[PDB]
Amino acid sequence: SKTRYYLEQCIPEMDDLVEKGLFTKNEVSLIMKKRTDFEHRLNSRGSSINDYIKYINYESNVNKLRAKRCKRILQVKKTNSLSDWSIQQRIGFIYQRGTNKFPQDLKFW
Amino acid sequence: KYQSSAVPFPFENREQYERSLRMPIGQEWTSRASHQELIKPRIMTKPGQVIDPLKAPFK
Amino acid sequence: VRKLKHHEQKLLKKVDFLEWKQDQGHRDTQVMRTYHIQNREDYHKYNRICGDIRRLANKLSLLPPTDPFRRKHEQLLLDKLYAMGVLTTKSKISDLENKVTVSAICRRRLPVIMHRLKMAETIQDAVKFIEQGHVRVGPNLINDPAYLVTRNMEDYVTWVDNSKIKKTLLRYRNQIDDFDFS
Amino acid sequence: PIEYLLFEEPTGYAVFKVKLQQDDIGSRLKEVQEQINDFGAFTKLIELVSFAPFKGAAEALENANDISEGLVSESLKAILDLNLPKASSKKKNITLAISDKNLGPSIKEEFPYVDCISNELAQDLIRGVRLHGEKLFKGLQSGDLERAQLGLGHAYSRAKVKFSVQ
Amino acid sequence: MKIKTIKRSADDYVPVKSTQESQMPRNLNPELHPFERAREYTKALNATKLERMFAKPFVGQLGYGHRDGVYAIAKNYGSLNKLATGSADGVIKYWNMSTREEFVSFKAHYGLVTGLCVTQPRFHDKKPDLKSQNFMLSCSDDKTVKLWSINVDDYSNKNNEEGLIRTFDGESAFQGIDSHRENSTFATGGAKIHLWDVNRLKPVSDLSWGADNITSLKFNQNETDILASTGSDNSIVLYDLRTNSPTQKIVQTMRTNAICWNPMEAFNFVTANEDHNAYYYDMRNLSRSLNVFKDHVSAVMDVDFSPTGDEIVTGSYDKSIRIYKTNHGHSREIYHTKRMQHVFQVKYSMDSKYIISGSDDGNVRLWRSKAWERSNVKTTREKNKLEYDEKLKERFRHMPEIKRISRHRHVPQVIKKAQEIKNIELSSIKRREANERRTRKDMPYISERKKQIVGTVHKY
Amino acid sequence: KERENQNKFERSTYTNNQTKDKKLRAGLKKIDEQYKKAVSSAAATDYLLPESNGYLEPENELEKTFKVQQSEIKSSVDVSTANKALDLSLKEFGPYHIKYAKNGTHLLITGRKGHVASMDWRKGQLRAELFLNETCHSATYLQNEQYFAVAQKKYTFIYDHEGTELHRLKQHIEARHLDFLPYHYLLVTAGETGWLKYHDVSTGQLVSELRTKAGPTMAMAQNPWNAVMHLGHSNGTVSLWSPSMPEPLVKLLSARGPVNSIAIDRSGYYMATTGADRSMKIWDIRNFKQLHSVESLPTPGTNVSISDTGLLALSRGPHVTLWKDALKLSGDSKPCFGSMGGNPHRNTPYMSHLFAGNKVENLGFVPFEDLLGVGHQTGITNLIVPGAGEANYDALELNPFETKKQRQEQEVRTLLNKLPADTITLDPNSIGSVDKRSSTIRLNAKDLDVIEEALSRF
RNA sequence: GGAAACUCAAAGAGUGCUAUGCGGAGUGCGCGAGAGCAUUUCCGGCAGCAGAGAUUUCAGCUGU
C-alpha cells in the first residue's frame, strides 16, 4: 500500500505547523483524516478525475486557511517554515499524478 | 541454538552485536518510509544495460 | 483452508487442520456413522473393553499351559464372548486378537441386529422405531439404542402389541386379527 | 538501449518511451516472456508519450501504402521529429525500435541523428504492445481498431488489386 | 460530567462504494506488536528456506556447443548480448546470447586457438563502422594472429566482408591476447610478449624481461595504459605502455593461470593460480596478496570480476565453478553440473547477472549469478519483499541454523572427498606446526596472504 | 524531533554501564544513527492514527466517576455503542463463560450445562450453536472464528465454524482452563490433573506434557508479550511456565490459600491476581517485585481482567468494580474503595456495577471497543466502560472489518510465520543475543637459613 | 421427500482492475542548455507611485 507512503510523506509539514502555534493537534488530526480518505480514494481502484479535483480543491482551501491563520495569529505573511512551499508543491504533485493517470481530459489538463 | 556462538567478524563483542540487532526492520515495528529507506542493497543495478568501468574524474 | 500455493505448500507440509495423527484415521467417527451410534464416547467405552480382553488373553497366554485356572478361565471367557454373541463360532484364542472388534461389539447392538433381521430397513429407521418405543426383547420394552443383545435374545426381538407398524404390516398381509388387540 | 519505439496502427502512429529495459540475456525465459502477456507488468516497461492519428481515411490508406513499400511519409516524419531528441555529434545516438529492416534505412536517411533497432528484443516488445493494444492509450484516440482495420483492409486490398468500380 | 467513547463510525474504515480500497489504520506501538525478534527471525528462516528452494541457477546452454572444447572466451565490453568463443580444434564463433545461437562460425587455425578478444579498431583510412559489423581477433598455436570481422545484425541502419580482414604473422607461437581498449593497440603473449597495433604487420615492441614464455595477459579497464601478464616462471609481470616497459615481477609458488583486473578499484587484480585458491592482489604493494579466496580442490583455471566490482567468479580444473564475494575469501556459491567437465574459461556478463562457463567437453553454458533471483521486472511489493528479507537474512546470518541452511549446498562427491581429505591434512599440518612452534625459538608467523609469495623484484 | 512517546518507542539493550577499528566505528555510528532516525520517524505516526481513546471525568466536585449509572451513559452515548451494549438472557443452561475473539468480531458463550454458541455479536449472526449434553467448563477461539475448542466433561474437543466436531483430544484427559497462544499457534490446556500441556494445533502435534507437581491448576492466564503461561495453583503459588523446560520458570508467591484468578496486562508489564484470602495483588513482571497489595476486599475476588489501556476489573461475586490508573508504580495508584474524608490521593474506582443476584463467573474486555463482556449465571452483559479499549487498532495483524479473503490470507500468513515452540522465553529479546558463556570480547587467533644456603646445589 | 432468495456459511475456478515512484533567479564551471557542483548575490518585507489585470492579483521606482 503506497497510500501509507504518501500519508506519512505529508507528516513533517504538519508537525512543524503544529509545533508553531497555528493549528492544534485536535484539528490537524481532522485534516489528516480527510487527507487519508482523499488519498485512498485517489490511488484506489476505479478512481476518477473528480476525486482529483476535490482533492485539489480541499488542499487549496486548507492552504488559504493556513495563510489566513498565519496572518491572524502570527501577524506575519509567512513563518519561513517547511509548510509554506510544501502545501502547494503537493498540490502540484496531485496535478502530476492526475495527468499521468488520466491524460485524456483537457479540463484537468 | 538460538543465541549465536561467538561474536561474528565485523563486530568485536556482544554489546556491538546486540546494538546492531536492537531495531527490527519490518513494516510492523517501523514506518513505511523508514522501512523503504532502511532496506535497499548496497549495489543497485539497472536491469538491462552494460556496466561501464568507471573513468572518473575530469572527463 | 486456502489450497495453498506451491511455495507455501513446500514451506509447510505437515499442516493439516482437518486430520491429525492422533485421530487414527477418524475410525471412531467412521464406524459411528457406519452403525449410527447416538452418543459420543460409545466407541471408546467399547474400545476399552476390546483392549481389556486382549490384555486378559495376553495374561492368560502368559500363564503356563497346564494349570486349570488358566484353562478354565480361558474357556470360560471364550464361552462368555460366544454367549454375548460377539463371536460367531467358538474359535481359537487367536481369534481373541484377530476377530474381536469394536465393529463386532457394535454389531451386536439392538438397531443393527434389527436391520440384520430386516425388522427395519435401515439402522437410522431402527433407531427411530426403538426411540419411539415400539420393540421389546421378551417381555420388557427397550427405549435406549445402547442395549446390545445376547446370543439368546436374537429370537424374541419383536415389536410390542398395539404398535401400529405391527398393525400396518398385518393389515398389509391382511392377517390382521383384532381379537388379540393388535 | 532501446529508448523509444514506434508503433504503426490503423488509426495513426504512436511513439512509446521505454522506462525500464527488458533483460537481454534471459529473453527466452518463461518468466520474461510471460511479462509481455501480463498487462500490469508490461506497463512497467513502456509508457505512451505520443499518438498522432491519421486525419482522413484517405491518408490512412496512403500511410499503409507507404509503410508497405517501406517509405517514410510526412505524418511519420512529423511524429518522429516531434518526439525524438536531437543528439550531439556521435555520442549518445538516439534509438528507435521499429518493426522492419526496410523501414530502417529510410528513416535513417531522413534522420541521421537517429538509430534504428529491429532485433528479437524490438519485435518482442512490439508484439507485446500489439497484444495489449488499445489498453495502453487509456482512451486517448478517436477510433476502434478492429473496425478501423476492417475498412483499411478492404481499401488496401482494393487498391492493390485495382478492383473496378463500374 | 462528560462522556465520550470511541466513534468507530463505519465510514472511514469500510468504503462507501464497492471499488475503492478500505483503510488499513495502523498503530506502530511496540505494545501492539509483541515479538519483534522471534518474528523476524522466523521470517529470516523462511527466507533462507525459500532461496534454498528457489536456487535454480542453470539458464541453458547456447547452440549445439563446440567440437573439441572451449578454451577461449571473450565478452565484448560495449554490448551485452554477444560474446566470442574459440575452441581448440581451431573453430571460433561469435555467439548471440539473446536467441542463444551464433552469428557466424569459422575454422580459424590449424592447431589450438589460445587467445581471442574483441576490438573496436581504428584504421587511419576508414571510419571504422563499429555498429553494423563487429570485430574480434584471435592468436593461436600456428604462429598467427587474425583480426576478424562479423556481420552482426542488431541495428538496422543499412540495406559483405565476412571473415579475415587482415592477418599478423609471428615467428614463434602465441598464447594470449588482450587489447588496449583505446587506440587499437593489442598485445600478445607467446614465447615473448609483443605489443602491436592493427595498422602495421610487425611487433611495435618486444616487452619481455628475459627468456620465459608468457602464459596469459590482460589489459586494464581503466588506466588502460597498464597491463599485467603471467609467465611460466610462476610469475606475475606488470607492464606499462607509456614507458613501454615491464615494471615489476613477483614469483609465486605455483603457476598463475589467469589474471583479471578490477573494473572498479582499477589497481587491484585477481590472479588464479594452480594451488587451489585465487589471490586478490593489489598493484601498488605487491608483497601482500590482500585477499585469498580458498575453497577449491584443484587448479583454478580462470577468473573474472563482476562488472559491479565486488563479486568475482573462478572456474577451476575440477568440474565446478564457484562465485566469491570480494571481502570474504570463501565460496558464496558453487555451480556444477554432471555434463560440464574441466571448466576452463568462465567470464561474467556485462550486466553482472549471468556467468558464462565454457567447459572442456565443448559446451558453453549460462548461469545466473544470484542463483535465487529471477530476471523479470517486479512489482514494487515483490521488490520490497525480496529486498526486505534479503536484508533480513543478512542481519540474521550468524544464527546457527540460518547459517547451516544458507551454507548447505550439494557438491559432487569427488569434490566432497577431496575437500574433506584436504581438511584433515591441513589440520595435520597445523598440528605439527603447533608442535614445532611450541619447542623452537623463532619460527616466525607468516600471514596466509604472504605465504604463497616466494619473491618480488624491486623490494621497495 | 521531540516525539514525546519516544520513551514508549525505545528498545533497550544489554549494556556495559571507543573502539579502534575505523570500519567498525563507522558501521556502529551508522547503525545507531539510523536507529535514532527510525525511532523518531516511527513516533511520527501519532499524528496519523485516526481517533483518540474515549474517557470520562467528573468535571465537578460533587459527583463521582463510580456512581454513574449504565442507564445514564447509555442515554448520553451514541446509538451505535448503546445498541452494541447487548444483554443476552439465557436461563435454562448454566453460568456462561465468555470468550471474545482476538478482535471484537465474534463471541463464544458456554453454559456449564451444555450450551456453546459461537456468534457474531455486532451483527446478529448465528455461526455455531450446539447443545452437547455433558458439562463444558470453559472454551475459546483458536485463531479465527473458524475454529473453537470447548473443554467438555473430560475430553477437550475442537470444533469447526458451523458446529461440527473435528478432534476429540485423546490427551488433555480433563481440562478446566484453555488458552491460545496466537503467534505460536499453541492451544494450551490446564486443569484438575496436575498437567499443563501444550498442543501445536497447526500440525496437530503435542508439544509439552509438563507436570505441574502442584495439584490442580486453579486459574491460568497468558502473558501476551512473552507468551509464558501463568498458572495459579492451590498453594497461592502463581508459577509461570514455558513449554521448553519442564521446571516452572518463575514461582511467584502472590496470595494465601488458593489463587482464584490471574490477569496479565497487554504490555506484559503488570500482573493482577486475586486469591481466596480476600486479597488482590498487583505485580511487576519484568523485575518481579510486588507492586502493591489490596488486602481485605470485603468478599473473595472471583475474577480479574485488565483492559488494553491498563484498566483493572474485579468481580466481587455480584459486583464489577473497575479501577483506572491502578497500574502505576506509586503509592497513590493503589486501588482503594474510599476517599477517606474526600482524600484526593486514592483510587476510588473508575466505575462500578452491582448485578442483581447472579454470580459473575468471568469478566473479559472487548478488544477494540469501550465495553467489557461480563458473564454471569443468567447470561451475558456488555458494560459500556468508556476508556477500556484501543481505539487505534493495527490492521496489519487483526482487523474488526476483516472480510473473507483477507481472513484466509491473514491466517495463512500467520501460519507461515508461526513462531516455533522453543522460543517461548522469559524475555522475548534473547534470540539474537550471544550465549551467556563464550565470553564477550572476541579473540581472532593470536592469544589463545645460612646452613641451607651452604647446602644448596645438592 | 423435490423447488423459490437479496436465506447465510465454506471452499474452487474464470473474467476483469493499473497491480502502478529551501524557491525565483542571478553568479563561474558541465558540450544554446540544464542533467550536477555553489550561494547572501537581490529576494520570498513595509507602505506609496503609476502601467495593468478580476475588492485581490502582477509590472518597474522612493525610502526601507
From Swiss-Prot, chain A:
HAT repeat segments: 86-109
Q: Which domain of life is it from?
A: Eukaryota
Q: Which GO terms describe its molecular function?
A: identical protein binding; snoRNA binding; U3 snoRNA binding
Keywords attached to this Swiss-Prot or TrEMBL record, sorted alphabetically, are:
Nucleus, Repeat, Ribonucleoprotein, Ribosome biogenesis, rRNA processing
Quaternary organization: Component of the ribosomal small subunit (SSU) processome, or 90S pre-ribosomal particle, composed of the 35S pre-rRNA precursor, the U3 snoRNA, and at least 40 protein subunits. Component of the PWP2/UTP-B subcomplex composed of DIP2, PWP2, UTP6, UTP13, UTP18 and UTP21. Interacts with U3 snoRNA. Interacts with MPP10.
User: So what does this one do?
Assistant: Component of the SSU processome, a pre-ribosomal particle required for the maturation of the 18S rRNA from the 35S pre-rRNA precursor.
What's the protein name?
U3 small nucleolar RNA-associated protein 6
Originating organism: Saccharomyces cerevisiae (strain ATCC 204508 / S288c)
Show which stretch of the intact protein is covered. Answer: 2 to 110 of 440
Swiss-Prot record, chain B:
Domain of life, source organism? Eukaryota
Subcellular localization: Nucleus, Nucleolus
Where does this protein have coiled-coil stretches?
A: none
Summary of subunit composition and partner proteins: Interacts with snoRNA U3. Interacts with MPP10. Component of the ribosomal small subunit (SSU) processome composed of at least 40 protein subunits and snoRNA U3.
The record's similarity note reads:
Belongs to the UTP14 family.
Q: What is the role of the protein in this entry?
A: Involved in nucleolar processing of pre-18S ribosomal RNA.
Give the misc comment. Answer: Present with 1470 molecules/cell in log phase SD medium.
What is the recorded name of this protein?
A: U3 small nucleolar RNA-associated protein 14
UniProtKB/Swiss-Prot annotation, chain D:
What compartments host this protein? Nucleus, Nucleolus
Per the record, the coiled-coil ranges are none
* Function according to Swiss-Prot or TrEMBL: Required for 60S ribosomal subunit synthesis.
Cite any additional comment in the entry.
Answer: Present with 13500 molecules/cell in log phase SD medium.
Q: Which family does it belong to?
A: Belongs to the NOP5/NOP56 family.
Q: How does it assemble?
A: Interacts with NOP1 and NOP58. Component of the ribosomal small subunit (SSU) processome composed of at least 40 protein subunits and snoRNA U3.
Q: What is this protein called?
A: Nucleolar protein 56
Annotated source species:
Saccharomyces cerevisiae (strain ATCC 204508 / S288c) (Baker's yeast)
The shown range, given as first to last of full length, is: 3 to 168 of 504
From Swiss-Prot, chain E:
Enumerate the PROSITE patterns for this protein: WD_REPEATS_2, WD_REPEATS_REGION
GO BP terms = maturation of SSU-rRNA; maturation of SSU-rRNA from tricistronic rRNA transcript (SSU-rRNA, 5.8S rRNA, LSU-rRNA)
Presence of the UniProt keyword Electron transport in the record? no
What quaternary structure, including any partners, is listed in this protein's UniProt entry?
Interacts with snoRNA U3. Interacts with NOP1 and MPP10. Component of the ribosomal small subunit (SSU) processome composed of at least 40 protein subunits and snoRNA U3.
Q: In UniProt terms, what function does this protein have?
A: Required for ribosomal RNA processing.
Q: Extra info from the record?
A: Present with 6620 molecules/cell in log phase SD medium.
Q: What protein name is recorded for this chain?
A: Protein SOF1
**Species whose genome carries this gene:** Saccharomyces cerevisiae (strain ATCC 204508 / S288c) (Baker's yeast)
**Gene that this sequence comes from:** SOF1
